[PDB]
Design a protein around this ligand. Structure first.
Ligand SMILES: *[C@@H]1O[C@H](CO)[C@@H](O[C@@H]2O[C@H](CO)[C@@H](O)[C@H](O)[C@H]2NC(C)=O)[C@H](O)[C@H]1NC(C)=O
Ligand SMILES: *[C@@H]1O[C@H](CO)[C@@H](O)[C@H](O)[C@H]1NC(C)=O
Lengths: 49, 191, 49, 49, 514, 667, 63
């Protein structure tokens, strides 16, 4: 998967001599519970605390 | 080689197909017999089609639709004819095919298709698959279903016929047909 | 593969031409910055391109 | 707190110019997250001949 | 009555608490506790509002106690079983899934049993399992000793196979197996040597057939020169319904396919001069060889129009699998004597159920209508099964009728669902569950460690056992119809008397002559 | 007396395998017939011919299939409209000019998402099928279009299996924001069209998330006096704002994307967003008045428009937010006919099915429905049927009725309405329809039912269909016959001899692949007279189950309901021999960022249903209509086919000083 | 034995929320509800699985 919270919705398809076939939309929501994110700045200068 | 139960079996069986198989002739009795190492055992082929009299020499890398008619205990099996050109153009035509069901005064019929997977194709392969489809989508050889015919159209006054009552004997199995030529198949199945 | 690399590049090329279309206007003249009256200059440049 | 958010700080200061990368971890009654960051560090008044 | 005990199995010393429901219709109930030794130990007279538990002594009989409830003075004798036994709810569930639902008592097929094993807490178990196969001659078992083998359960999975040849070498006398059951004794044991469980894949049936055809659900009488609807019911060898099994009768070149409940309504066209009606049903299944799949025959009689009038009534029920709160149309078909039907004014129907006459009503017909149809609105009452009887009268002298019987989806009359969040909780933590149901409803909850809940499947009370247990009251006795107009009313559990001293046979009692 | 019965689709499709069938109630000497398709007036060119031989063996019904392989002009457009159908019997011989189209197949242009932000890459693929519904190795061209009418890019690919993967299209560094349009078209002979939309928007990193949700997405008297409005604000996921002024304003608006709206002096003042949330109530009745000159929600079937500005008083910031419309409806309900044609056979119960969707276009369980109706005699008389009431099924929003019609009627006018034990009489949902009599001087009609509702219909099942043939001066019916249509082509046909004595009877038709999405079935008998001919029929439509024929399935390694990020996962794929798969993963949340109708693949079958030249439950107005209404036209009938006229569209069914100023000077 | 006394919704359902403390058990709980009503009579519920667990722990398989 991709480390990135979101509810993925994955739907394939299969077209073959018999016809096209829309398979069954399969959902996969990533994590929840309790997480953490960080606010790291673009730049910081040596000697800065 | 009649019956009903029987028919269901022989037509239900595992069909297989091969190529690049060149083999020299040896007659075990009447006129022929050959053999081939498929990759697992050692087969056996009884050519004796009106196309065998032009082929008592042997095979050169042809396509042979081998379906077991009867088996020995080592994986090897005898099959009749089924030989086609090779290089057989893997052109893939979609052919019309009507299927009617008779029942005294009653009629249920269908327009449908058959998938020819070659350029030239053994009437043996035709015979088999034509009935294969039938047996699973048209209830052939289950119950009263066991009488009927298969007329294949080729040109404005040419057709080949096949009684369903008794799979078409082995001598015409060496026969062969040009895919492009098949206007279409008509099958009627009475009860 | 040559006929391929050529493709790729032609593509980059169109995709990169497309950029500037945004700054084109009502009457088919181009503005310096987006939303600004259009400049005889810039429009001439875009022609040059 | 329930259905909420708590905050986090790390007071830090870098010495190596442009040194990077910090594994940042959070364990909870459910498991461990290793979130990975990268910190950017820099000199003071730049120019290139 | 219907008993519910907190769990199916008990520590000595624990207190078994029960609650006892009655499908409401001075409320005094007798409850009794018998030990499996057989001895009585408590005779209680509770009101349906409150009751206590039976304290099992830290020292008391072991086995399968029977809690038995009834009504003061009226042999309802309903019952419920609990196990009480020195044990240790092991920490992990085992589930078995056999390869086929049955074993061909004369075939070649080897018998696979798949094993999945997971900690109650929902993670895969790792370990080792001994599986021993055998056959159950009624209340005796018979090991296939050599069939006992050891198998690694890895990431929770693993297959335990029985070999045909070993089978034969234990039972070459085929005649002995006839009508019995293969059983798989499976013991699984965590790799840690710590905990270990044992269950049994039982009730695998040995037979020649993969299916079973049954006709009792389709009437034994028909209307000549009228389409007769045959209703085939196809059980898996146990009793369960098996769906999507195709059936046919070549005698009619008519075929169908059982459904979600084991029924298929194959319609039949019937030539006029008919009287007998022999039908032979085969279980056509594109995977089973003919000789395997099962067959069964029956022969149905024609109706006997009153005084040979020729005035027939058929009432077809069109739909299938019927949900309460459904609109299902019902077809009224007449036939016969011209200047007879000319004066067929109104149909009279009654809906029988639970063995009493629920709703009754009239369906007008206007002239020229030989087929007049009406929308019926199913409502909870008719659960689980209702009958439709209907008739018309010509000129105040002739009565002719028909009854069809219908299964309504064996479901909850009202609603009840325990709503939650389904996210992984933490020990002793604070929990919220919403409760959705019928207003004013009294709800009896219980919470239970997966352990007990799996360990004793059979004893639990279930909507299923409920409904069946009530259906087993409706005084009806065939899928409907009858010899004759009277016979429809008799068979259908009704009794009839008309000004014209035309009457139903004397009812002998509940139950019906086989 | 004894005519033949040549039947075939109302139109032909060029490059289409086209089915033509041919009954004949007619004598026993087997014979031969030529069926050709020739040029539209000329008749010298013969595009294709089949020589069917109907005989006794053949119940004198057979069929062959014809085709028109691109024979026109490949450098100058201009099609031909029209072309001739023809039969050449030993006995009869007859033709029928009739239309053709270059509309063959369908192109479904799968766009990897439906909103895009600058520099993003529009991943695009096209599924591409032919009338027949097989792949169709066809050279295909898509052409992109900006939001203002400029054919930006335009590329073409070849095709080897139905899935043409196209060269992604990168937005630009700095795009023309809007409603981008992708157009699909085949390059050659045909003319089929596919079309797709994708919204390209500018990303702005805001300082709040400003949620703004109302009571329900519509107003009906229930809340006309007070409309609830909850409005929220937050930051990084879960942390909510805390202190904020909130300003709302309202207006009324004729609809949507009309970039205009009459807004009302009474911009409901600060409720003040306190702690992630704020809430307001809004009187529709009150506001609607003075400025908007409306005074009764009758004068309202248009949208209430909301505009909110939240400004966090703490750091001094501000985001806007808004709903563009919340439609005003004179009833919570709206209802419609389902699976029930407005054509009735006398002496035959007429079924009636109403769906009661809510304003939110959903099925609504447990709704009371009332049915009134007046009947008119052939005699001209008028009869008031006594009302009939029924309640809408739990899941179908389907209320079912049946009424047995008096033989003597020929036009049935009716009335559906709702009856919620609270709604006002005015504010109930009402709808009026009228149904005409199958007309036939034969006086004889026909009607076919079958035992189903909640109709699954699984392929491999056998449909038990009851044919009742009433009102015939004369029942004297030799044979019932049948056509099975599906996907604008015929795929089953045949005959059963009636039962020479009894009323209604039963045909047993097996359900097969060919008929998979949905199939039409029509059944006709031949009543004859020394005025040699009378054909008469009926047709139903048949929702059989969406079974892909091959059988694609797909699953993930652990089927749990939450997946920790990045966790390596498997993707397994079930199929029917050797099928071809085009997977696609998207953020389910993209969808919610454009209220626009669902663009996921499920809109396929529907789109792919326009295939069917059908139109309604079936059951036309006269042996003619019935057939045309089922997508056919026929040749033979001594009795005669009607050449339609033209195709009407039809639908099936399954505070002041300032405002005075700026407003004024807003020249 | 909780009693669903509470105005129903449009649908005729009553919804009674419930607070309670889970157990120290490290396992999977299963809630079974039964309802008796005057009219509707009996009704066996839909077994609700409540599933407890923590990331680190002890199993004390003990006789
Ligand atoms: C109800 O429960 C008891 C079991 O305690 C049933 O047991 C039998 O009762 C009959 C009736 O007199 C006795 O003659 C037998 O001694 C009992 N033995 C068996 C074989 O069960 C009892 O039958 C039940 N009541 C009814 C409906 O008869
Ligand atoms: C951080 O963790 C990763 C994988 O999670 C590992 O491969 C790496 O060596 C770690 N780096 C640091 C800074 O500790």
């Amino acid at each position: 998967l991709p480390d990135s919270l979101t509810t993925w919705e994955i739907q394939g398809v299969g077209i073959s001599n018999t016809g096209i076939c829309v398979a069954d939309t399969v959902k996969a929501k990533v994590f929840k519970d309790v997480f953490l994110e960080m606010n790291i700045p673009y730049s910081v200068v040596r000697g800065e605390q | 080689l009649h019956d009903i139960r029987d028919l269901h079996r022989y037509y239900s069986s595992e069909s297989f197909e091969y190529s690049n198989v060149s083999g020299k002739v040896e007659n075990y009795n009447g006129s022929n017999v050959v053999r081939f190492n498929p990759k697992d055992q050692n087969h056996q082929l009884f050519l004796l089609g009106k196309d065998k009299e032009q082929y008592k020499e042997g095979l050169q890398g042809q396509n042979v639709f081998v379906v077991q008619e009867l088996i020995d205990p080592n994986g090897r099996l005898s099959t009749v004819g089924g030989v086609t050109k090779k290089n057989n153009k893997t052109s893939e035509t979609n052919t019309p095919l009507f299927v009617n069901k008779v029942n005294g005064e009653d009629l249920d019929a269908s327009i449908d298709s058959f998938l020819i997977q070659k350029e030239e194709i053994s009437l043996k392969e035709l015979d088999f698959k034509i009935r294969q489809q039938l047996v699973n989508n048209y209830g052939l050889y289950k119950g009263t279903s066991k009488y009927g015919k298969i007329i294949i159209n080729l040109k404005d006054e040419n057709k080949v016929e096949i009684d369903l009552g008794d799979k078409l004997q082995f001598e015409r199995m060496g026969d062969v047909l040009n895919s492009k030529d098949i206007r279409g198949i008509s099958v009627t199945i009475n009860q | 593969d040559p006929l391929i690399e050529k493709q790729k590049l032609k593509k980059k090329l169109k995709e990169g031409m497309l950029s500037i279309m945004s700054y084109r206007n009502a009457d088919y003249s181009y503005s310096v910055w987006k939303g600004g009256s259009a400049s005889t200059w810039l429009t001439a440049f875009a022609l040059r391109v | 707190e329930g259905s909420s958010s708590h905050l986090v700080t790390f007071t830090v200061l870098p010495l190596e110019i442009g040194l990077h990368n910090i594994n940042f971890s959070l364990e909870t009654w459910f498991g461990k997250e290793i979130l990975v960051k990268t910190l950017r560090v820099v000199p003071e008044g730049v120019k290139r001949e | 009555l219907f008993i519910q005990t907190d769990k199916g199995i008990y520590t000595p010393g624990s207190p078994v608490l029960y609650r006892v429901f009655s499908m409401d219709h001075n409320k005094t109930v007798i409850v009794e506790f018998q030990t499996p030794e057989g001895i009585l130990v408590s005779s209680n007279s509770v009101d349906l509002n409150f009751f206590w538990p039976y304290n099992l002594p830290d020292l008391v009989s072991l086995g399968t106690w029977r809690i038995v409830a009834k009504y003061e003075h009226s042999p309802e004798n309903y019952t419920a079983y609990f196990d009480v036994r020195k044990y240790v709810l092991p920490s992990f569930e085992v589930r078995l899934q056999p390869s086929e639902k049955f074993f061909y008592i004369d075939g070649n097929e080897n018998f696979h049993v798949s094993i999945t094993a997971r900690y109650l807490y929902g993670e895969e178990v790792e370990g080792v399992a001994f599986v021993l196969f055998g056959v159950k001659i009624d209340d005796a078992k018979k090991s296939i000793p050599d069939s006992l083998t050891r198998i690694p359960i890895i990431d929770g999975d693993g297959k335990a196979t029985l070999k045909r040849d070993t089978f034969r070498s234990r039972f070459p006398n085929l005649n002995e197996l006839v009508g019995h059951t293969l059983y798989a004794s499976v013991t699984v044991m965590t790799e840690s040597g710590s905990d270990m469980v044992v269950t049994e894949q039982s009730g695998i049936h040995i037979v020649a057939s993969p299916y079973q055809i049954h006709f009792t659900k389709t009437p034994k009488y028909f209307k000549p020169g009228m389409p007769y609807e045959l209703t085939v019911y196809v059980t898996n060898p146990d009793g369960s319904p098996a769906a999507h099994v195709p059936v046919v009768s070549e005698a009619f070149h008519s075929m169908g396919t059982t459904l979600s409940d084991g029924t298929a309504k194959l319609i039949l066209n019937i030539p006029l001069n008919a009287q007998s009606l022999p039908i032979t049903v085969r279980t056509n299944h594109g995977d089973l060889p003919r000789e395997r799949q099962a067959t069964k025959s029956m022969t149905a009689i024609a109706y006997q129009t009153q005084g040979g009038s020729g005035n027939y009534l058929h009432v077809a029920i069109t739909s299938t699998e019927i949900k309460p709160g459904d609109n299902l149309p019902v077809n009224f078909n007449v036939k016969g004597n011209a200047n007879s039907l000319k004066q067929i004014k109104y149909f009279t129907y009654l809906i029988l159920n639970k063995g009493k006459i629920f709703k009754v009503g009239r369906q007008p017909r206007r002239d020229g209508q030989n087929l007049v149809t009406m929308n019926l609105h199913i409502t909870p009452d008719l659960i689980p099964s209702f009958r439709f009887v209907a008739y018309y009268q010509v000129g105040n002298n002739e009565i002719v009728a028909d009854s069809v019987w219908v299964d309504v989806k064996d479901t909850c009359m009202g609603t009840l669902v325990v709503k939650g969040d389904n996210l992984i909780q933490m020990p002793g933590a604070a929990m919220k569950i919403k409760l959705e149901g019928d207003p004013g409803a009294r709800v009896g909850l219980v919470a239970v460690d997966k352990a007990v809940y799996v360990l004793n499947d059979k004893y639990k009370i279930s909507q299923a056992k409920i409904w069946d247990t009530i259906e087993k009251s409706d005084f009806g006795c065939t899928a409907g119809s009858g010899q004759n107009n009277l016979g429809v009313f008799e068979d259908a559990g009704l009794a009839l008397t008309t000004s014209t001293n035309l009457n139903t046979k004397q009812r002998s009692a509940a139950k019906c002559p086989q | 007396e004894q005519t033949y019965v040549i039947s075939a689709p109302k139109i032909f499709r060029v490059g289409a395998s086209e089915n033509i069938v041919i009954q004949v109630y007619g004598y026993t000497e087997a014979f031969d017939a030529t069926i050709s398709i020739k040029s539209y007036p000329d008749k010298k060119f013969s595009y294709s011919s089949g020589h069917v031989h109907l005989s006794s063996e053949n119940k004198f019904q057979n069929s062959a299939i014809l085709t028109i392989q691109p024979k026109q002009l490949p450098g100058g457009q201009n099609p031909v409209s029209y072309v001739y159908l023809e039969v050449v019997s030993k006995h009869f011989s007859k033709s029928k000019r009739m239309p053709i189209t270059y509309d063959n197949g369908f192109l479904f242009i799968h766009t990897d998402k439906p909103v895009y932000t600058p520099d993003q890459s529009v991943k695009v693929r096209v599924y591409s099928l032919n009338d027949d519904l097989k792949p169709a190795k066809r050279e295909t061209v898509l052409t992109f279009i900006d939001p203002e009418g400029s054919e930006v890019d335009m590329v073409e690919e070849i095709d080897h299996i139905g899935i043409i993967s196209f060269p992604d299209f990168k937005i630009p560094s700095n795009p023309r924001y809007g409603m981008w349009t992708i157009k699909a078209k085949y390059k050659e002979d045909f003319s089929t069209t596919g079309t797709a939309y994708f919204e390209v928007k500018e990303y702005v990193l805001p300082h709040f998330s400003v949620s703004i949700e109302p009571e329900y997405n519509f107003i009906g008297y229930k809340n006309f006096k007070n409309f609830e409005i909850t409005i929220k604000a937050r930051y990084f996921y879960n942390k909510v704002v805390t202190e904020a002024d909130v300003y709302i304003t309202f207006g009324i608006r004729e609809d949507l994307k009309d970039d205009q709206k009459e807004m009302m002096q009474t911009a409901m003042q600060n409720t003040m967003l306190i702690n992630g949330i704020a809430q307001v109530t809004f009187d529709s009745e009150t506001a609607v008045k003075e400025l908007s000159y409306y005074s009764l929600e009758d004068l309202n079937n248009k949208y209430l428009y909301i505009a909110v500005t939240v400004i966090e008083s703490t750091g001094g910031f501000s985001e806007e937010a808004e709903i563009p419309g919340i439609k005003y409806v004179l009833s919570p309900y709206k209802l419609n006919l389902v699976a029930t044609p407005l054509f009735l056979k006398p002496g035959i119960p007429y079924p009636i099915k109403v769906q009661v969707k809510d304003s939110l276009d959903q099925l609504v369980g447990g709704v009371p429905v009332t049915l009134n109706a007046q009947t008119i005699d052939v005699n001209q008389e008028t009869s008031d049927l006594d009302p009939s009431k029924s309640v809408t099924r739990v899941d179908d929003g389907v209320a079912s009725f049946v009424l047995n019609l008096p033989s003597g009627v020929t036009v049935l006018e009716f009335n559906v309405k709702t009856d919620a034990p609270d709604l006002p009489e005015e504010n109930q949902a009402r709808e009026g329809y009228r149904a005409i009599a199958y007309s036939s001087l034969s006086q004889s009609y026909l009607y076919i039912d079958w035992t189903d509702n909640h109709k699954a219909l699984l392929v491999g099942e056998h449909l038990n269909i009851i044919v009742t043939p009433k009102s015939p001066y004369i029942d004297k019916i030799t044979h019932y016959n049948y056509l099975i249509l599906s996907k604008g082509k015929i795929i089953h046909f045949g005959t059963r001899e009636k039962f020479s004595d009894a009323s209604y009877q039963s045909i047993n038709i097996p359900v097969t692949q060919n008929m998979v999405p949905s199939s039409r079935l029509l059944v006709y008998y031949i009543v004859t007279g020394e005025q040699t001919a009378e054909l008469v029929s009926d047709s139903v439509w048949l929702n059989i189950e969406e079974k892909c024929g091959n059988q694609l399935q797909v699953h993930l390694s652990p089927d749990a309901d939450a997946y920790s990020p990045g966790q390596t996962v498997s993707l397994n794929m079930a199929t029917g021999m050797d099928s071809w798969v085009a997977l696609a993963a998207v953020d389910s949340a993209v969808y919610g960022v454009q209220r626009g109708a669902k663009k996921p693949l499920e809109r396929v079958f529907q789109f792919l249903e326009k295939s069917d030249l059908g139109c309604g439950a079936g059951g036309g107005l006269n042996n003619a209509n019935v057939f045309h209404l089922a997508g056919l036209t026929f040749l033979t009938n001594a009795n005669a086919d009607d050449s339609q006229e033209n195709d009407e569209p039809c639908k099936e069914i399954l505070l002041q000083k300032k405002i005075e100023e700026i407003a004024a000077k807003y020249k | 034995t909780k009693d669903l006394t509470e105005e129903p919704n449009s649908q005729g359902i009553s919804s009674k929320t419930m607070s309670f403390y889970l157990r120290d058990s490290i396992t999977t709980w299963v809630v079974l509800a039964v309802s008796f009503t005057p009219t509707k009579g009996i009704c066996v519920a839909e077994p609700y699985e409540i599933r407890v667990m923590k990331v680190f722990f002890i199993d004390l398989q003990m006789p």
